[PDB]
Symmetry: C3
Subunit: 154 residues, 3 copies
């Protein structure tokens, strides 16, 4: 069945946004900050925010499919020298909001960050209709990001 086969091929084709900002100086402040708003002003080194990051409404958006979305944010940067307790926090709005935190303390010298998660998108569900506002906040002190890689795939 060519039509059923084509549907299976579509279902098993990864769709994604994978955007790299190399050589930027993005301050991630200590106050809640819309992440897409922060990124959309920057010229990417590679990739595009579309289709998963909507630069008009400053949100992550998804395809209307019963297919899970995988998300990763990799940040190279620094907190100020001497900052001990510190964390990077990223919240996704949703029916139940999800709050990611990468915390560290005096024991860890590296300031680089890797946040990863997934969203089990339902057809005609909350994410499919509303998208998700991503709100980022640096805790302990402001963070200065010099490379950012952001991925959403479904």
């Amino acid at each position: 069945g060519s039509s059923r086969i084509s549907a299976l091929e579509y279902a098993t084709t990864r769709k994604k946004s994978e955007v790299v900002y190399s050589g930027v100086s993005v301050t991630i402040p200590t106050a809640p900050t819309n992440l897409v708003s922060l990124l959309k002003t920057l010229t990417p080194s590679s990739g595009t925010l579309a289709p998963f990051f909507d630069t008009v409404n400053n949100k992550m958006v998804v395809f209307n499919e019963n297919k899970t979305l995988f998300f990763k944010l990799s940040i190279v940067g620094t907190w100020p020298s001497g900052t001990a307790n510190r964390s990077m926090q990223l919240t996704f709005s949703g029916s139940v909001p999800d709050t990611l935190v990468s915390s560290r303390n005096s024991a860890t010298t590296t300031d680089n960050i890797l946040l990863a998660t997934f969203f089990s998108v339902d057809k005609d569900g909350f994410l499919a209709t509303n998208g998700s506002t991503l709100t980022i906040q640096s805790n302990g002190a402001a963070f200065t990001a010099t490379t950012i890689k952001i991925i959403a795939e479904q």
Copy 2:
């Protein structure tokens, strides 16, 4: 050949199976002692979703389909530790051939108490998870935690 049967099998293979359960507007203590998570949740009435088929409420464990398909797990908890709690963490252990221990730790720099634990389990046909399931044991560290919304997902 077996074309028809193989297409139907592929349709099954690419259909997500899931439990996605939300408990909204609750007030649930996650204590500092090890607590069977399924035992804790099954006392609550879901606002949406069902524990079946991934959470066995007789044996109080997560169970999986016997197929070479990875299971993705997420636990999202809205709640609080007592005011002033500085060092604190939420931990979740899954029994297995090698047990896995998830920890979300934080300190004075982070004021939010909300928790997001996510992972995967690479289920093998006739393997440990498929044969035994996994006991999930949750524990709050620093002080007891009071959860007001819980969302739990297992999918395969």
Copy 3:
């Protein structure tokens, strides 16, 4: 016929899942090539091949537009009394990724679970170069007694 067989390939998981049991392995406080460390140990089950290259001491991937999922589960210990402590794992790449599992006095368990994914592109950086995995223990060295490592694609 062939589109069906191709779909069967596309939807079949490929994996390395290696368990090292009953070991007492120091993960030092200095950067350490993880594949170099593991390949000295005898697995209780599984094989480093095909995802872990023990000649160049790196993770390697299939040259396919298919995401790789990675998990490292470690049973072990920091020295008694260690409060602030963390385990970190860096993957080289076009942009390197640094995973950190940190904890403090509130947490008693020392066991570690690091999980992530890599959105491999055909003929992309990972497919062309692989990834060097560098592990480091912070606060004090960590003694690992069971290690389970998974890469799947």
